[PDB]
Amino acid sequence: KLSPGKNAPDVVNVLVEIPQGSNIKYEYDDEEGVIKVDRVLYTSMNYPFNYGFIPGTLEEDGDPLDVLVITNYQLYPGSVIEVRPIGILYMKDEEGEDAKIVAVPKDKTDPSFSNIKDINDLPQATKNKIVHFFEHYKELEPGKYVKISGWGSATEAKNRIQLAIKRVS
Amino acid sequence: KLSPGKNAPDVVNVLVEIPQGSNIKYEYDDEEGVIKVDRVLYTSMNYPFNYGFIPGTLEEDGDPLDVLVITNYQLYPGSVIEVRPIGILYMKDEEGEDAKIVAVPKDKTDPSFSNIKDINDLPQATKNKIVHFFEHYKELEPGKYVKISGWGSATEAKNRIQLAIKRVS
Amino acid sequence: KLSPGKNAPDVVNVLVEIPQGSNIKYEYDDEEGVIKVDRVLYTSMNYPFNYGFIPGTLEEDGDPLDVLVITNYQLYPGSVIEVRPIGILYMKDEEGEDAKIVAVPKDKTDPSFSNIKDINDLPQATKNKIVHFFEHYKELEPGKYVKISGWGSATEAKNRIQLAIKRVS
Amino acid sequence: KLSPGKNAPDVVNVLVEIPQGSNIKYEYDDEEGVIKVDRVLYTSMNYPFNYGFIPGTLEEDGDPLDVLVITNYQLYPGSVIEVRPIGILYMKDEEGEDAKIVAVPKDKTDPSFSNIKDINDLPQATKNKIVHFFEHYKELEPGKYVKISGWGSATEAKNRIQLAIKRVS
Amino acid sequence: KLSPGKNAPDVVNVLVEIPQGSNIKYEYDDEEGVIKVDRVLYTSMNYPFNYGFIPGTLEEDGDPLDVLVITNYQLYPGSVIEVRPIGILYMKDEEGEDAKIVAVPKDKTDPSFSNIKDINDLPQATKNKIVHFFEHYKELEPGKYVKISGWGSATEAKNRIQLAIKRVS
Amino acid sequence: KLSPGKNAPDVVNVLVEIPQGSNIKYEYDDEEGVIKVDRVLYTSMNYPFNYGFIPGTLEEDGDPLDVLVITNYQLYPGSVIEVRPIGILYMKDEEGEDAKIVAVPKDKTDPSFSNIKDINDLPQATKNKIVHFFEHYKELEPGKYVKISGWGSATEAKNRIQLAIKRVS
Ligand SMILES: [Mg+2]
Ligand SMILES: [Mg+2]
Ligand SMILES: [Mg+2]
Ligand SMILES: [Mg+2]
Ligand SMILES: [Mg+2]
Ligand SMILES: [Mg+2]
């Protein structure tokens, strides 16, 4: 009942699962059609961004493409927001390779993020925080782990989204 | 899947979209069936009431009738509450004429609003706050504006709801 | 669209209606498919636990089986969490007999409740708080009342869930 | 270093100890000059008002006169607010007789409480909530109890404040 | 008992009075030594920044120099934070001329604001929000008003702070 | 103006600096007598406990003895609470050796922690969370680091407190 957006990949729809600041990992279950509590982070950390996925996309891992929506406020689990991809984050975990889109709200939704057009527009401190988060929030979970490969530019991210949409199309 | 209520217009159902205190304009999309983030208020203001609409009603502007639910607590976006209309607010914006119902929770739901039976039961300060809100929260948005015409009594509001229901029913 | 869980009664699904700390009694309406606001507690109290029901179960009172999910954080109304029943609470109200399951999140979801395996693992103070809550939160409501009969063990609770599931299944 | 106010008893200073909605009983210790945590309510209730005392007053019980500040927002422990007494609440506990002033913020501070000039201006539901609170929040505490005698008018309250001030000054 | 800071004007101490997001105007009273509640904004707006003053400074208006601390989190009323002035805001109100320093936390305190070195580093949207705030938050107050003259650079701000300190020193 | 408590080391006073859940490192400055914002954690973590120190104590590092107050609620910065030491945490950082007391509120203050009498009463998950926190929250800060040596029993903790008090007295 949801699509990636008429203007993909320049602007895409993101269904929020985890509000920013949260320390509870919610996960949207398309089958049952509900937001399920996967697990309460075993570490004393919290999501430094709103987390969700672009509906109508499919990655090589069989899952829709994830998005790290950067704002200074939280959104409600299950709400949809239109974002602008500004980059991509490459990483490897116990399951294998993975990539997550990094985005800010589209300009008309929140004009205070208009100057952030690419991953290099983010303060170094913010990038370090995000990287550190992914590399330590699952540590205390038996057999899990994450290692950040590197970052990608907005153009790169836009491509990943294109393929992800094509796979389902 | 929702109706205005078996006791309309004395008591009607309101599907909440924007929780009170919020500064993010959420919008319920009946098509996709989700709560979408329209935009984050460009001004440093926040909704002085829970905002939503009466399902199963239609106004001359092609949209369902809006309601300003007055309480001293927030409700969750997407939840339904039974209210008592106590008035109506008339205004004009860039799109034209508009009217919004003003209501408090029905007595059984919250007996602390039982003595507020009509618009004149609200403190002058509260009315001024609401009027000022509508006249300034969109200011910074290009080409958008709002001007309050005046207020209407509960009886007036009950009528508006009656017509709005007929149009559909 | 929801079930009690593949591992019932050892681990069951609970659809949350009232987040912990809340003083607003939300109700999930399966018909309309929405979370409605039943009422705002007339007393100055708040739910000392996340409240919800096990989907796909039926009790002698014609309603699904309730669950008191104990955690130190709130969950979003309408979200599903997997719990471990650790006990049962027996009570009688104006409508008659009633029983409510007491549970903690399943181990993988929140390993900090792993030591709590049965009702006697809960501090006496916590039990007194819960009992006192049920016996006083409806007091100010005309003709309503609740009296706690006693507590049951985890095994007892697991049985109640078994029957409740069979009735429907 | 604090006084009851230049306009006592029409408008008095109230040093807030317990923010509204709180379930932790804070107490201001004039000796040490700090806000101490007396106890965390044993019951699942919370203060339906901001609680504090009028500095520079003394009652027959050797303690300053208490005030129940009614607002729809919380104030910070240790902050001072100017209120308008609108009534008085008479009660008896394990220690003996007691009276607590009921007030709303002074008009200039919050004009939305301007219509509430006396205790009878408060909704019945609000009064019942407050009374029920005092009669049940200490129940689970060994040997403590409270019974509400009745209410007093604003004029009555203004007198109590006058005496309480004279005793000290 | 507080000073502007050993590194003034490059880094100065700011005693916070109003936490960001607040809609209650708190005021630090050096005499009584407490945080008072001046009033509750009559408009439905809230401070888009943490507000406070640099202790040990004096302006031509007889008051210490104000500071608009920009962060994406709130600080506790009465707490001190070390900031970096990045600009100054010139305005006119019913009382006359006025200037307010604009600052971000010093780098060690919060390295995510390190890239904001001057007023022109702030998004246009953020500046518009702040300006709009000052020009409308007092509107509903009888006889009050504010008009923004313009902005000043960090160097300008550093000078204002220098004078303000010498007046007292 | 504050002491460790008449019943030290069985029950001691703890002046709270950092409320639980916080991600801003507040620090009490006895000189200026204010709560200062040291820094906003560079990592996406938050204090899994209320943090503070026992007034009137001195450790070999020239600083008062720290305490990790464990509760499921936050306390206000600058407030004092009476705790029961249940253990001690040994660690080493860039500055050298360090020990921090672990405590729960005294029984009368919060009877729901009465069953936790020693460090081994805490769930393994909780201990892992605390250890992981200390070992990663300063990581992104240049030249800082922390390594946990091990835990100590309540008796051990009581001794450390005794010496720390003796040094000052
Ligand atoms: Mg993936
Ligand atoms: Mg309309
Ligand atoms: Mg039942
Ligand atoms: Mg008394
Ligand atoms: Mg000035
Ligand atoms: Mg130390």
Q: For chain B, say whether D126 makes contact (Cβ under 8 Å).
A: yes
Chains E and D touch (3+ CB pairs under 8 A): yes
Residue E49 in contact with residue D95, Cβ under 8 Å?
no
Question: Packing angle between helix D124-136 and helix C124-136, nearest 10 degrees?
Answer: 150
Report residue F8 as tokens.
């030290």
Question: Packing angle between helix F124-136 and helix A124-136, nearest 10 degrees?
Answer: 150
My answer on whether omega of the bond before A4 falls inside 30° of 0, hence cis, is no
CA D91 to chain CA mean position, Å: 13
Contact residues for E69 (Cβ-Cβ < 8 A; gap 6+): E14, E16, E20, E49, E50, E51, E52, E75, E81, E83, E103, E104, E105
- B40 vs B18: CA distance, rounded Å: 12
Query: For chain A, what is the largest distance between any 2 Cα atoms, rounded to a whole number of angstroms?
Result: 43
**In the Cβ-directed half-sphere of D122, how many Cα atoms lie within 13 Å?**
24
Resolution (A): 2.7
Closest CA to F3 of F86, F80, F108: F80
Distance in Å, alpha carbon of B36 to nearest chain A alpha carbon: 5
Residue E152 in contact with residue E100, Cβ under 8 Å?
no
Query: CA angle C110-F40-A111, nearest 5°?
Result: 95
For residue A99, how many other CB atoms are within 10 A of its CB?
19
Q: Which residue of chain A has the CA closest to C14?
A: A36
Residue B116 in contact with residue B87, Cβ under 8 Å?
no
Question: Packing angle between helix B124-136 and helix E124-136, nearest 10 degrees?
Answer: 150
Record: contact F44-A133, CB cut-off 8 A: yes
- F166 vs F161: CA distance, rounded Å: 9
Residues, CB within 5 angstroms of ligand 6 (ion):
F 59, 61, 98
- Cβ burial, residue B69 (10 Å; 0-12/13-18/19+): buried
Cβ contacts of A15 on chain B, cutoff 8 Å: 34
A33 alpha carbon – ligand 3 mean position (Å):
26
- Which bound ligand lies closest to the C-alpha atom of A54? 1
DSSP string, A96-124: EEEEEEEEEE-TTT-GGGTT--SGGGS-H
Q: In terms of DSSP bridges, do strands F66-69 and F50-53 run parallel, antiparallel, or are they unpaired?
A: antiparallel
- C85 vs C13: CA distance, rounded Å: 11
Report residue F112 as tokens.
């729901």
Report residue B37 as tokens.
């983030």
Mapping DSSP to helix (H, G, I), strand (E, B) and coil, where does residue D56 land?
A: coil
Mapping DSSP to helix (H, G, I), strand (E, B) and coil, where does residue A47 land?
A: coil
- C88 vs C154: CA distance, rounded Å: 7
Cα–Cα distances (Å) from D139 to B108, C3, D47, D147, in that order, read 28, 40, 15, 11
- F106 vs F84: CA distance, rounded Å: 5
Contact residues for D63 (Cβ-Cβ < 8 A; gap 6+): D53
Q: For chain C, say whether B82 makes contact (Cβ under 8 Å).
A: yes
Record: contact E80-F26, CB cut-off 8 A: no
Cβ contacts of D48 on chain B, cutoff 8 Å: none
Tokens 């100017």 correspond to: D82
Q: What are residue A100's DSSP bridge partners? A: A66, A89
Distance in Å, alpha carbon of C26 to nearest chain A alpha carbon: 17
Distance in Å, alpha carbon of F112 to nearest chain E alpha carbon: 29
D9 alpha carbon – ligand 2 mean position (Å):
48
Closest CA to A57 of A158, A169, A164: A164
Q: For chain A, say whether F133 makes contact (Cβ under 8 Å).
A: yes
Mapping DSSP to helix (H, G, I), strand (E, B) and coil, where does residue C13 land?
A: strand
My answer on whether omega of the bond before E9 falls inside 30° of 0, hence cis, is yes
Mutate to test the interface with B, among D112, D128, D131, D132 (most CBs of B within 10 A): D112
Mapping DSSP to helix (H, G, I), strand (E, B) and coil, where does residue C18 land?
A: strand
Phi and psi at B142, nearest 5°, equal: -55, 115
Q: Where are the alpha helices (DSSP H) in chain E?
A: 124-136, 154-168
In this complex, which chains have at least 3 CB pairs below 8 Å with chain F?
Answer: A, C, D, E
Residue F47 is labelled as binding a ligand: no
Report residue C75 as tokens.
């969950």
DSSP string, B66-135: EEEE--SS---TT-EEEEEEEEEEEEEETTEEEEEEEEEE-TTT-GGGTT--SGGGS-HHHHHHHHHHHH
Residue D144 is labelled as binding a ligand: no
Considering only CB atoms, F44 lies closest to which of A42, A45, A140, namely: A45
Cβ contacts of A42 on chain C, cutoff 8 Å: 111
Phi and psi at E103, nearest 5°, equal: -145, 165
Q: What are residue F67's DSSP bridge partners? A: F52, F101
Closest CA to B156 of B95, B75, B92, B102: B102
Record: contact D47-C42, CB cut-off 8 A: no
Residue A31 in contact with residue C2, Cβ under 8 Å?
no
Mapping DSSP to helix (H, G, I), strand (E, B) and coil, where does residue D26 land?
A: strand
E154 alpha carbon – ligand 1 mean position (Å):
45
Give the H/E segment covering residue F165.
Answer: helix F154-168
Query: How many H helices and E strands in chain F?
Result: 2, 8
Cβ contacts of E15 on chain F, cutoff 8 Å: 34
Q: Provide Rg for chain A, Cα atoms.
A: 15
Residue C55 in contact with residue C164, Cβ under 8 Å?
no
- F39 vs D83: CA distance, rounded Å: 37
Contact residues for C31 (Cβ-Cβ < 8 A; gap 6+): none
**DSSP for residue B45:** B
Residue B80 in contact with residue B15, Cβ under 8 Å?
yes
In this complex, which chains have at least 3 CB pairs below 8 Å with chain B?
Answer: A, C, D, E
Q: Which residue of chain D has the CA closest to B110?
A: D125
Record: contact C80-A33, CB cut-off 8 A: no
Chains B, C: CB contacts within 8 A come to 43
C147 alpha carbon – ligand 6 mean position (Å):
51
Chains A and E touch (3+ CB pairs under 8 A): yes
Mutate to test the interface with C, among F115, F117, F131, F132 (most CBs of C within 10 A): F115
Chains B and F touch (3+ CB pairs under 8 A): no
Q: In terms of DSSP bridges, do strands E80-93 and E66-69 run parallel, antiparallel, or are they unpaired?
A: unpaired
Q: What are residue B88's DSSP bridge partners? A: B101, B152
Considering only CB atoms, C125 lies closest to which of F72, F114, F126, namely: F114
- Cβ burial, residue B95 (10 Å; 0-12/13-18/19+): exposed
Name residue C58's amino acid: L
Q: Where are the alpha helices (DSSP H) in chain C?
A: 124-136, 154-168
Cα–Cα distances (Å) from B65 to B16, B38, B158, F97, F120, in that order, read 12, 18, 12, 67, 60
- F163 vs F169: CA distance, rounded Å: 9
Residue A157 in contact with residue A62, Cβ under 8 Å?
no
How big is chain D, counted in residues? 169
The domain limits of chain A are: 1-169
**DSSP for residue E111:** G
- Cβ burial, residue F150 (10 Å; 0-12/13-18/19+): exposed
Method: X-ray
CATH 3.40.50.720 fits D1-169, yes or no: no
Distance in Å, alpha carbon of D132 to nearest chain E alpha carbon: 29
Residue C66 is labelled as binding a ligand: yes
Cα–Cα distances (Å) from B57 to A88, B69, C29, F115, F131, in that order, read 44, 17, 21, 57, 57
- C126 vs C107: CA distance, rounded Å: 20
Cβ contacts of E39 on chain D, cutoff 8 Å: 108-110
